[PDB]
Amino acid sequence: HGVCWIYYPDGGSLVGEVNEDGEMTGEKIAYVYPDERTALYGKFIDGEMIEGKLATLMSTEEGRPHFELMPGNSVYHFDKSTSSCISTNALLPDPYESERVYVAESLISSAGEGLFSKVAVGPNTVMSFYNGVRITHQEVDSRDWALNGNTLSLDEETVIDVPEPYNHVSKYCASLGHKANHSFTPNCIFDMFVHPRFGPIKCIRTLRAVEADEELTVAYGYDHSPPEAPEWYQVELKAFQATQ
């Protein structure tokens, strides 16, 4: 008759009545995003999202979340990428990310597209998800930089990549973290994130307050003394080192 909340370090949570074994299994389980408001509500088995419908957390009463389902039929499921498949629904956006960021021309000279805040947010705010296919450090490190524009180290065994042609929003928009440009004076950082659709990935989180329509940037963090990096970054490392 009791409800349980299980938080991840990133601030997302699973919430619901657990079954006889303390498992998040049932028809009224929810994943709640770190805004404590956007939710995916429905059928879960041992914490894995089978059918999550988009909802808004309207209140909690005695610890129990009360949701309203959003109109339409936006449904989501656990859909972890593989080495060759980025997503079963490449064009289905993440509903939390879609309210926080958009892609447009970067303000950085010659940098192509960039990622921008849709609204004003405070520090420590998760803005965007960096999902991609999962490949090895060996494959990535043993191939040319021209193929490594979007590679992100996840851990000691896995690199996340958004390979062509999925680097174009018309082909892939389920997540947008690969659209954030680099800065040596960034307003965001990469952080671990456990996503109900993508699984274990990284996210982009603000390290300070950001304004509406501000470009989001992250330090790519290439090794400066192995520099092991693409030319544009090396040219920029020089400039940045000068300003110091």
Partner: peptide, 7 residues
């Protein structure tokens, strides 16, 4: 490594 954000 030829990827972002390695430890």
């Amino acid at each position: 490594s030829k990827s972002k954000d390695r430890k």
